[PDB]
Design a protein around this ligand. Structure first.
Ligand SMILES: *Cc1cc2c(cc1C)nc1c(=O)[nH]c(=O)nc-1n2C[C@H](O)[C@H](O)[C@H](O)COP(=O)(O)OP(=O)(O)OC[C@H]1O[C@@H](n2cnc3c(N)ncnc32)[C@H](O)[C@@H]1O
Ligand SMILES: [Cl-]
Length: 381
């Protein structure tokens, strides 16, 4: 049979999670992907992702993150793959000059999250490998940390398939035909139907959501990360060097302690190239900005980590104008759920988004507050 209860189109961060939460409750599921997840053509590779809880971008993100973390700890117990390590997350920036730092500190206070404050040289006294100007301030969230993103997806896939999920790889969906009774997807090697549809195509949502007659502002961006050889005594996870997300003079950078000699991983969040996901150049170094922007940060703030570029990765964000997610039912078809526009900060929530999508596909509603992620909101018109 080519009929399923639910088809998930795009089996990456959000879709593979949805497939797991569906399949584990006995929902007959088909997961369809253009590639073989986890892979290096979407938004989930580069090994590691930050999860943090002191989310200043809006109050609704906080219970979403707290649920996500509960779900990650549950996944850790079910698989042999490593899911999460509690590095803590350091946020810093200029005193009275970083909306991001201020909003984080306020969030940590409002929601009563465990944290510690540092000013200036106090940062370096805690972690030798970081140096900031005297007028910088910082907040450290010790309970947050790092997800091994490719492991997360692989674990969800293995568990979903063992529960009965069917996974179709190297099979791009070319079109959708939907009614309220029947969902049909068209591919090169044939068609499949279901009762319900979950659409979670990452950067390709920006090209293919038009096939469901949904028109929203989504812009893919090419975002690189580099791994640098570094003094392990200062920058290893074994030395308790934290993951970080910081605001400096030219914007926001994020990074990770070295794990097993991977080197320190760093990305520049505040710039990337506007791209089409079918023609993006996935070679690190293809643009001179790739390495240059990373070294400018390291030589100033983490000078002992400004070593050999061991490797690089090219990844994509998909941004909405307000940088809030889109998680909703299709306005015409109550049997179609859409997850899009994660704006470079969606991985940490992929567990709870998966759970939400499974609830939406299965019941038409969710217990979680997704009010700020709606399709009908003014920023998307
Ligand atoms: C790239 C980036 C993102 C990022 C990050 C650093 C970089 C360099 N750092 C993060 C961080 O530390 N903390 C965090 O919470 N998120 C961070 N991110 C953002 C995050 O990775 C993304 O928001 C998230 O991965 C997006 O998930 P999504 O599920 O939306 O995207 P995907 O994993 O790429 O999955 C999409 C899948 O769909 C398949 N596809 C595409 N088109 C089709 C068609 N036509 N048919 C079938 N399948 C399709 C893709 O192949 C992919 O598997
Ligand atoms: Cl994204």
């Amino acid at each position: 049979s080519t009929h399923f209860d639910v088809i998930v189109v795009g089996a990456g961060s959000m879709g593979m999670a949805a497939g797991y939460y569906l399949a584990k409750q006995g929902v007959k599921t088909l997961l369809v992907d253009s590639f073989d997840p986890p892979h290096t053509n979407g938004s989930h590779h580069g090994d590691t992702r930050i999860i943090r809880h002191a989310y200043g971008e809006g109050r609704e993100y906080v219970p979403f993150a707290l649920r996500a973390q509960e779900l990650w700890y549950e996944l850790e117990k079910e698989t042999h793959h490593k899911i999460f390590t509690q590095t803590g997350v350091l946020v810093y920036g200029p005193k009275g000059g970083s909306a991001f730092v201020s909003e984080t500190m306020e969030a940590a206070n409002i929601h009563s999250l465990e944290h510690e404050l540092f000013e200036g040289k106090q940062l370096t006294d805690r972690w030798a490998g970081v140096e900031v100007p005297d007028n910088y301030e910082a907040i450290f969230e010790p309970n947050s940390g790092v997800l091994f993103s490719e492991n997360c997806i692989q674990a969800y896939r293995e568990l979903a398939e063992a529960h009965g999920a069917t996974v179709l790889t190297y099979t791009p969906v070319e079109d959708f035909e939907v009614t309220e009774d029947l969902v049909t997807i068209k591919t090169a090697k044939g068609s499949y139907t279901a009762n319900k549809l979950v659409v979670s195509m990452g950067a390709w949502n920006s090209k293919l959501l038009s096939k469901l007659d949904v028109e929203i502002p989504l812009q893919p961006y090419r975002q690189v990360v580099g791994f640098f050889e570094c003094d392990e005594a200062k920058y290893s996870n074994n030395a308790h060097y934290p993951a970080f997300m910081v605001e400096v003079e030219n914007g926001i950078y994020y990074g990770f302690p070295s794990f097993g000699g991977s080197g320190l991983k760093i990305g520049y969040h505040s710039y990337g190239q506007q791209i089409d996901p079918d023609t993006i150049n996935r070679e690190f170094g293809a643009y001179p900005e790739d390495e240059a922007n990373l070294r400018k940060f390291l030589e100033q703030y983490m000078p002992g980590a400004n070593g050999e570029l061991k490797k690089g990765a090219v990844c994509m964000y998909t941004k909405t104008p307000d940088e809030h997610f889109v998680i909703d039912l299709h306005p015409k078809y109550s049997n179609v759920a859409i997850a899009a526009g994660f704006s470079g900060h969606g991985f940490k929530f992929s567990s709870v988004v998966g759970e939400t999508l499974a609830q939406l596909a299965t019941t038409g509603k969710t217990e979680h507050d997704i009010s700020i992620f709606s399709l009908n909101r003014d920023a998307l018109k």
